[PDB]
Ligand binder design. Structure first.
Ligand SMILES: *[C@@H]1O[C@H](CO)[C@@H](O[C@@H]2O[C@H](CO)[C@@H](O)[C@H](O)[C@H]2NC(C)=O)[C@H](O)[C@H]1NC(C)=O
Ligand SMILES: *[C@@H]1O[C@H](CO)[C@@H](O[C@@H]2O[C@H](CO)[C@@H](O)[C@H](O)[C@H]2NC(C)=O)[C@H](O)[C@H]1NC(C)=O
Ligand SMILES: *[C@@H]1O[C@H](CO)[C@@H](O[C@@H]2O[C@H](CO)[C@@H](O)[C@H](O)[C@H]2NC(C)=O)[C@H](O)[C@H]1NC(C)=O
Ligand SMILES: *[C@@H]1O[C@H](CO)[C@@H](O[C@@H]2O[C@H](CO)[C@@H](O)[C@H](O)[C@H]2NC(C)=O)[C@H](O)[C@H]1NC(C)=O
Ligand SMILES: *[C@@H]1O[C@H](CO)[C@@H](O[C@@H]2O[C@H](CO)[C@@H](O)[C@H](O)[C@H]2NC(C)=O)[C@H](O)[C@H]1NC(C)=O
Ligand SMILES: *[C@@H]1O[C@H](CO)[C@@H](O[C@@H]2O[C@H](CO)[C@@H](O)[C@H](O)[C@H]2NC(C)=O)[C@H](O)[C@H]1NC(C)=O
Ligand SMILES: *[C@@H]1O[C@H](CO)[C@@H](O)[C@H](O)[C@H]1NC(C)=O
Ligand SMILES: *[C@@H]1O[C@H](CO)[C@@H](O)[C@H](O)[C@H]1NC(C)=O
Ligand SMILES: *[C@@H]1O[C@H](CO)[C@@H](O)[C@H](O)[C@H]1NC(C)=O
Ligand SMILES: *[C@@H]1O[C@H](CO)[C@@H](O)[C@H](O)[C@H]1NC(C)=O
Lengths: 409, 118, 48, 48, 97, 95
């Protein structure tokens, strides 16, 4: 650090990073009477005296299942129409083969989606999700086609076509870098983008713990169900766990009291399971809301929020489906290869101070230029890219120099 | 040769050997599930369809138009081959609606209009 | 029995209150950004 | 009795931990957007 | 308000405000068998017949503890490197001492 | 203690202070650049000029009022110290 030195990048790098967010969990509904005692009529008659201790659990589980369906619907269903990429795929050098659907495969999933998918009763039933995996893949393909062909437009009104090179120029202009930077480095940027996507596929294929959150959700649900089933076969201080023996080899009074104790134990187990499921569903709903927000802001537009859609300056994102989750590919612009320079707040030309309209003053070491704050393209100081305000007495750090004017024929 | 009955991961008996003839039998739980009534509202009609969740229609009469879905077996709805927006969600991409004489149909979900930007 | 019923009611009320608090936080954020300013966040303050 | 007391304590701790995690997520977001950048969101990073 | 009058500031004010957010809580862990009855063998034998009730609570508390650690890590650990201010602190009149 | 124990946090208080100091030093020296790639130095007057330009006020407003703005910032920080020291109920949430 020093009071008159500034560092400005002379190159850049296009980096693609992934992000996994669970959106829904498996919809299990457990019957109360069947779980507590599915075959003993007298046990059900005894349980009937407990009131509505078996309707609350069913209502809670039904609400949880409805919540899961709503989570998936709000995360993925965000397009009014189903867009399609043109059969000709000359996007100026950018190659989206890894994310676009593959018609050869029967499931019509892309390469990365296939990698993600391959890598990842005593009265209990598991309901099927309302949206099949093919419909989720269709939504993802529609979002990808709309983003590639249209850009911002298809998420805020009528979809409008625009060449991908010009869309990328708009996205560059939206982070503080002019259009000529992309237009004069189109092949390099396209090659960097393709290489980054290839590295992303390789990294997802190599490491075996990248998709940790979805596996965590699945394992937690399975462990909860297994614990419930194991808790089913316990004595709870009675003579035997199974109530058939209790009802057979015992007098009606003592058999009744033992059945009551077993009923209390199993009811407590079911209540604990339901409470844990409710808390877990709240957590999953928070995650699904975050995923929906990221889809709305990173995929359907360009976000200026720092560290939200990736790591760097956001350019675009691509959604990818996953089992009970979603995966984003945040394309970001990261500067590289900086160079030291000497800066100056203003310039004193004719007794009047000159400030840059946009950019910053730098110095080769002998001369002075005006350059962008993010990319180093120096240019001669002129009247059009500077504005005059005040005299040369109040600015602390002004530098004597000369400015040029176009009007001099 | 010395094993009598089998168990799954959850310590639930799922296979037994017949003591007389040494053959293996597979134990399958007796079918069960919930019953769901699909109605277009009393303000429109008094005709309803019934869904047996996760149960084959073969065990249905034991305990109109029969259609078997992934979420279960749909009794009382005529399966069309078209595709409309989801009115009543049944499960696994199947939706039901009251269309036109007058009947309850059960189509496959449609994900919106088909578009292709030039 | 009555204590179990009351405890179940209290737990359900606690979870419902947490959900309502999340909704109220979202509403406060939307009032701060949509009403008192003009958000550039996509699909936050309406469609368009 | 003691098992009921322990389970009540655990459930309350779980709900409190959920609330604290929401607060920590908000703090992480504010650190990412206010400190490492300059937010245009109204009344997020202070008043003004 | 009138259809031709506008008010425009002529000065400003640099105001600093604080904001406090709790990011983590104390990591506790309560044993089940010891809490219920720490020394009675008969009591432990009776409790063993209740099933896996002292495992779920321990699992939940361990999850809470690791969640607290992750909360602190995600809130604070957001810099790859450790930057240091220069020994001479002349920031144009701004005093960060 | 009836079978209850309190585990210690993984990150000690000195480590949290080290993170906070690193963040402050990066903000003062680099600006927002250190949070989006390579850290690029910039004078604090010029960084504050950029931040003024970000809210719709030109750079000359800062450059022609640098001393007044610096004094306002210093007075504000001193008032923060005094307000935190006097009022003991500010830390309501942690308590
Ligand atoms: C910016 O960095 C890229 C590398 O990411 C540079 O491109 C390399 O240039 C050298 C020499 O020109 C070639 O040998 C490499 O094959 C190039 N790599 C790629 C991936 O294209 C580029 O030259 C740099 N720009 C500047 C101005 O230095
Ligand atoms: C886009 O990239 C993919 C892979 O990165 C290219 O597919 C490769 O094509 C070559 C030539 O036919 C094959 O030898 C490779 O095996 C293919 N790779 C894979 C993974 O299948 C594809 O050709 C690129 N797009 C264009 C238009 O060239
Ligand atoms: C200061 O800037 C000038 C202008 O670009 C640099 O001088 C140029 O140097 C190149 C390479 O030697 C020549 O081809 C040009 O003819 C020079 N132009 C002028 C106007 O001198 C100079 O190199 C820069 N200073 C330093 C220390 O690099
Ligand atoms: C149990 O007794 C039955 C009745 O005899 C046996 O079944 C017969 O086994 C002989 C053995 O060669 C067969 O030839 C017959 O065809 C069988 N009859 C029937 C009706 O199955 C059975 O094998 C005996 N089991 C054991 C373990 O000894
Ligand atoms: C803008 O406000 C500042 C204070 O917020 C004014 O500075 C004060 O000016 C008065 C009058 O000369 C002095 O008595 C004070 O000591 C000044 N305060 C400070 C902190 O310097 C400033 O004059 C105002 N701007 C204009 C154009 O009047
Ligand atoms: C920033 O402000 C602090 C607090 O006013 C200054 O520290 C004081 O410096 C004077 C000068 O010798 C001492 O008499 C005081 O005792 C210091 N106060 C404290 C609390 O230590 C500090 O000097 C200022 N920074 C600069 C660069 O001047
Ligand atoms: C700028 O100068 C400093 C002075 O030590 C040096 O450490 C740094 O490496 C220089 N920048 C570059 C890009 O070399
Ligand atoms: C920078 O600091 C040096 C000494 O530290 C001083 O001589 C010079 O005038 C200062 N320049 C500016 C623009 O503050
Ligand atoms: C800039 O030029 C003016 C007029 O020639 C002169 O008064 C002033 O001292 C010069 N500044 C420096 C730093 O030499
Ligand atoms: C619907 O399609 C199936 C399969 O092609 C066919 O068997 C059936 O007859 C069709 N039904 C109608 C009404 O077209």
């Amino acid at each position: 650090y020093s009071n008159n030195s500034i560092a400005i990048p002379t190159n850049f790098t296009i980096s693609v990073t992934t992000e996994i967010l669970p959106v829904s969990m498996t919809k299990t509904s457990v019957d109360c009477t069947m779980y507590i005692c599915g075959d003993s009529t007298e046990c059900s008659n005894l349980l009937l005296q407990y009131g509505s201790f078996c309707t609350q659990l069913n209502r809670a589980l039904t609400g949880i299942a409805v919540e899961q369906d709503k989570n998936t619907q709000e995360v993925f269903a965000q397009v009014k129409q189903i867009y399609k990429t043109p059969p000709i795929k000359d996007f100026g050098g950018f190659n989206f083969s890894q994310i676009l659907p593959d018609p050869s495969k029967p499931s019509k999933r892309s390469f990365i989606e296939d990698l993600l998918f391959n890598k990842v009763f005593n009265g209990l039933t598991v309901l099927p999700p309302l949206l099949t995996d093919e419909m989720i893949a269709q939504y993802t393909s529609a979002l990808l086609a709309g983003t590639i062909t249209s850009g911002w437009t298809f998420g805020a009104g009528a979809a409008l076509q625009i060449p991908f090179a010009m869309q990328m120029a708009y996205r560059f202009n939206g982070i503080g870098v002019t259009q000529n930077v992309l237009y004069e480095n189109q092949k390099l940027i396209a090659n960097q983008f393709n290489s980054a996507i290839g590295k992303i596929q390789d990294s997802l294929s190599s490491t075996a713990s990248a998709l940790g959150k979805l596996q965590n959700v699945v394992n937690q649900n399975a462990q909860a169900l297994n614990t419930l089933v194991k808790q089913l076969s316990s004595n709870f201080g009675a003579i035997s766990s199974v109530l058939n023996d209790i009802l057979s080899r015992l007098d009606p009074p003592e058999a009744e009291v033992q059945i009551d104790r077993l009923i209390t134990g199993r009811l407590q187990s079911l209540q604990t399971y339901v409470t844990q499921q409710l808390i877990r569903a709240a957590e999953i709903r928070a995650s699904a809301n975050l995923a929906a927000t990221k889809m709305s802001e990173c995929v359907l537009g360009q976000s200026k929020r720092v560290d939200f859609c990736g790591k760097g300056y956001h350019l675009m994102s691509f959604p990818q489906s996953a089992p009970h989750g979603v995966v984003f590919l945040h394309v970001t612009y990261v500067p590289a290869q900086e160079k030291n320079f000497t800066t100056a707040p203003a310039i004193c030309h004719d007794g009047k101070a000159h400030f840059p309209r946009e950019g910053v003053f730098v110095s080769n070491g002998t001369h002075w230029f005006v350059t962008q704050r993010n990319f180093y393209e120096p240019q001669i100081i002129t009247t059009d890219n500077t504005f005059v305000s005040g005299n040369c007495d109040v600015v602390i750090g002004i530098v004597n120099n000369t400015v040029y004017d176009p009007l001099q024929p | 040769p010395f094993q009598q009955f089998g168990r799954d991961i959850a310590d639930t008996t799922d296979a037994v050997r017949d003591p007389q003839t040494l053959e293996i039998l597979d134990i399958t739980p007796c079918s069960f599930g919930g019953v769901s009534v699909i109605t277009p509202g009393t303000n429109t009609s008094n005709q309803v369809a019934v869904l047996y969740q996760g149960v084959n229609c073969t065990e249905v009469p034991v305990a109109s138009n029969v259609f078997q879905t992934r979420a279960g077996c749909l009794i009382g709805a005529e399966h069309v081959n078209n595709s409309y927006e989801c009115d009543i969600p049944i499960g696994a991409g199947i939706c039901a609606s009251y269309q036109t004489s007058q009947s309850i149909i059960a189509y496959t979900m449609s994900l919106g209009a088909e578009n292709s930007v030039a």
